[PDB]
Amino acid sequence: MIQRTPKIQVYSRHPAENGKSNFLNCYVSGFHPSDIEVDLLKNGERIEKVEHSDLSFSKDWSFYLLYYTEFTPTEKDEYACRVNHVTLSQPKIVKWDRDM
Amino acid sequence: AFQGPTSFHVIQTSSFTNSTWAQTQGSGWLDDLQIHGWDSDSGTAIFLKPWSKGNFSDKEVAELEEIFRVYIFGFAREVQDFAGDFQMKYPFEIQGIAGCELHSGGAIVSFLRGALGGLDFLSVKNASCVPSPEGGSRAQKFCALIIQYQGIMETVRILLYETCPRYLLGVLNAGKADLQRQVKPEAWLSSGPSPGPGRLQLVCHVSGFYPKPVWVMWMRGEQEQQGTQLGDILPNANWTWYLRATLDVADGEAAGLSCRVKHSSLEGQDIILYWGPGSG
Ligand SMILES: CCCCCCCCCCCCCCCCCC/C=C\CCCCCCCC/C=C\CCCCCCCCCCCCCCCCCCC[C@@H](O)[C@@H](CCCCCCCC)C(=O)OC[C@@H]1O[C@@H](O)[C@H](O)[C@@H](O)[C@@H]1O
């Protein structure tokens, strides 16, 4: 059996202009097994109604998902993606970064 | 070639928590573009586009359904039986991908490739179960113990060969509508995470573009730097993709650089963003 760590990338659908509604995206990929936990936070709180792709994998058999929710950024407002997988020691949190 | 998908295939992730607890997740694709969803606990389907069905009839469509629907129910019902037999340790997960694809002129090759343990397990070639060495005792054990079901094999061939391109070319056309459409880009430079304090992280985004193929380089006049780290084409929930592309350089040398951005949807009218000053 194999166990692949999930890879996490976060990003906005359009270059954010504070005060202007964007799309926060969180793309987990390359993990395995497919049981995973994903959330998208706002200042550390799990944002509510979020949509996400349907399970799907790649040639090497690793799965990936696209989590994303509409949001309106500011100078303040810290946003991050919290991933939890059998292969992780403790929930992994990657924060968004307008610059990154 | 003609711009868009070149294959359609289904996908199956059946996860086995234990002898009586199995959960299977299926879906239908065209490269990355998912056009078919399978609502599970019911047994139906989810067409995500008018052209999801493909020049196929509400009569044949609804026909495939039961095949799939029952296959799933059966596939699980079975695995749990031979679970001890093939000495499976719970929990395990088995994946499956199968479909056909077009190729450089007019020869349509299909495929059905299964996995277990996140590993290769079996491949169908010239209509016949082929035990990926990756499997072992069990792969042969199954590949063989399964050939002895001509009906199953019967269905497998038809769909896989007969029913597939008849459908493939079918939807591709049925939906050449927006499958060949063209969405131009976006773009916006930005600098962040400094390498060796005194150097700079030139970051050139590019979003919303469709089709997927795309060009992006941190050039300086006629020429490029190529030290340019082309990122991964991640995706947007809308059928378009995102794409970072960093550049590594020193304080001064930054200024005077730009991000060129070709694309099938721009027509020589590339995107150029020069590396301005101060205001990020
Ligand atoms: C008795 C069998 C014993 C088996 C022992 C197994 C021991 C387990 C050890 C571990 C082995 C790992 C093996 C991994 C194999 C992976 C195969 C994956 C293949 C394909 C992916 C399928 C994706 C499914 C979800 C798709 C969702 C699509 C949505 C919409 C469709 C919209 C229209 C477009 C149509 C386009 C079609 C494109 C081509 C696709 C072709 C894919 C192949 C489909 C195969 C369908 C065969 C139907 C078979 C069933 O009749 C049968 C299955 C039995 C299990 C074995 C399957 C092996 C496959 C190689 C079945 O169970 O019949 C049950 C009977 O039902 C009743 O009549 C009655 O109660 C009884 O007679 C039976 O219950």
- Write B231-239 long-range contacts (CB < 8 A, 24+): B232/A9, B234/A9, B234/A11, B234/A25, B234/A27, B235/A27, B235/A66, B235/B32, B236/A13, B236/A23, B236/A25, B236/A68, B236/B207, B236/B208, B237/A23, B237/A25, B237/A51, B237/A53, B237/A66, B237/A68, B238/A13, B238/B208, B239/B33, B239/B210
Tell me how crowded residue B64 is: count the other CB atoms within 10 A of its CB.
Answer: 18
Pairing between β-strand B240-242 and β-strand B119-124 as defined by DSSP bridges? unpaired
Contact present, B202 and B248 (Cβ < 8 Å): yes
How far is Cα B16 from Cα B212, in angstroms, rounded to an integer?
A: 35
**Which residue on chain B is closest to A30 by alpha carbon?**
B118
Residue of B24, B183, B184, B207 to mutate, testing the A interface (most A Cβ within 10 Å of its Cβ): B207
Contacts with A3 from chain B: Cβ below 8 Å: 118
How far is Cα A53 from Cα B32, in angstroms, rounded to an integer?
A: 11
| Nearest CA owner, ligand 1 atom 3 | B78
Of B97, B100, B43, B99, which Cα lies nearest the Cα of B71?
B43
How far is Cα B227 from Cα A90, in angstroms, rounded to an integer?
A: 35
Q: Which token pair is B240? A: 């378009």
Whether the link from the prior residue into B213 is cis, omega within 30° of 0, is no
- Rounded to the nearest angstrom, the distance between the alpha carbon of B220 and the centre of ligand 1 is 56
- Looking from the CA of B190 toward its CB, the CA atoms found within 13 Å total 15
The dihedrals phi and psi of B265, each to the nearest 5 degrees, come to -100, 15
Tell me how crowded residue B247 is: count the other CB atoms within 10 A of its CB.
Answer: 23
How far is Cα A49 from Cα B148, in angstroms, rounded to an integer?
A: 49
The dihedrals phi and psi of B18, each to the nearest 5 degrees, come to 180, 165
The dihedrals phi and psi of B93, each to the nearest 5 degrees, come to -140, 130
Amino acid letter, A99: D
The single-letter DSSP state of residue A69 is: E
As beta bridge partners, residue A46 has A41
* For the CA of B11, the nearest atom of ligand 1: 23
What residues contact B142, with CB distance under 8 A and at least 6 apart?
B86, B122, B129, B131
How far is Cα B91 from Cα A39, in angstroms, rounded to an integer?
A: 25
**Which residue on chain A is closest to B39 by alpha carbon?**
A54
| Nearest CA owner, ligand 1 atom 6 | B79
Of B205, B211, B202, which Cα lies nearest the Cα of B232?
B205
What residues contact A70, with CB distance under 8 A and at least 6 apart?
A21, A22, A23, A24
Given A33, A57, A100, which is nearest B192 (Cβ)? Answer: A100
Report yes or no: A67 at the B interface, CB cutoff 8 Å. no
The dihedrals phi and psi of A59, each to the nearest 5 degrees, come to -50, -55
Experimental method: X-ray
Residue contact B118–A62, C-beta within 8 A? yes
Q: Which token pair is B175? A: 């939906």
| Beta strands in A34-86, from DSSP E residues, in sequence order | 36-38, 41-42, 45-46, 51-52, 56-57, 63-71, 79-85
Contacts with B16 from chain A: Cβ below 8 Å: none
Q: How far is A83 from chain B (nearest CA, A)?
A: 17
How far is Cα B236 from Cα A70, in angstroms, rounded to an integer?
A: 12
N- to C-terminal Cα separation, chain A: 35
Q: How far is A38 from chain B (nearest CA, A)?
A: 16
Complete DSSP assignment for chain B:
--SS--EEEEEEEEEEEETTEEEEEEEEEETTEEEEE--TTT---EE-SGGGS-S--HHHHHHHHHHHHHHHHHHHHHHHHHHHHTT--SSEEEEEEEEEE--TTS--EEEEEEEETTEEEEEE-SSSEEE-TTT-HHHHHHHHHHHT-HHHHHHHHHIIIIIHHHHHHHHHHHTHHHHS--B-----EEEES-SSBTEEEEEE---SBBSS----EEEETTEE-S--EE---EEETTTEEE--EEEEEEHHHHTT-EEEB--TTTTT--B--B---S--
Q: Write out the H or E segment, with its range, that includes residue A30.
A: strand A22-31
The single-letter DSSP state of residue A20 is: B
Amino acid letter, B96: G
Query: Is the minimum distance from the CB of B26 to ligand 1 under 6 angstroms?
Result: yes
Q: Which token pair is B260? A: 């060129």
- Measured on CA atoms in the order B97, B98, B100, B103, is the torsion positive or negative? positive
Report yes or no: A54 at the B interface, CB cutoff 8 Å. yes
Contacts with A14 from chain B: Cβ below 8 Å: 186, 207-208
Q: Which token pair is B203? A: 């970051």
Q: Which token pair is B177? A: 């509508």
Strand order in the sheet with B199-204: B189-192, B199-204, B245-250, B229-230
Contact present, B181 and B265 (Cβ < 8 Å): no
How far is Cα B17 from Cα B80, in angstroms, rounded to an integer?
A: 10
Amino acid letter, B210: Y
How far is Cα A90 from Cα A67, in angstroms, rounded to an integer?
A: 20
Contact present, B131 and B145 (Cβ < 8 Å): no
Contacts with B93 from chain A: Cβ below 8 Å: 33-34
Amino acid letter, A1: M
**Which residue on chain A is closest to B93 by alpha carbon?**
A33
Strand order in the sheet with B217-220: B223-224, B217-220, B258-260
Report yes or no: A63 at the B interface, CB cutoff 8 Å. yes
Resolution in A: 3.1
Virtual CA dihedral for A83, A88, A89, A92, nearest 10 degrees?
-20
Q: Write out the H or E segment, with its range, that includes residue A92.
A: strand A92-95
Q: Write out the H or E segment, with its range, that includes residue A7.
A: strand A7-12
- Rounded to the nearest angstrom, the distance between the alpha carbon of A64 and the centre of ligand 1 is 24
Contact present, A20 and A26 (Cβ < 8 Å): no
Q: Which token pair is A26? A: 């969180």
Domain annotation for chain A: domains and CATH numbers: 1-100 (2.60.40.10)
Of B106, B107, B156, B115, which Cα lies nearest the Cα of B134?
B115
Contact present, B215 and B263 (Cβ < 8 Å): yes
Q: Which token pair is B142? A: 């199954």
Domain annotation for chain B: domains and CATH numbers: 5-180 (3.30.500.10), 181-276 (2.60.40.10)
Contacts with B208 from chain A: Cβ below 8 Å: 13-14
Q: Which token pair is B14? A: 């059946």
N- to C-terminal Cα separation, chain B: 40
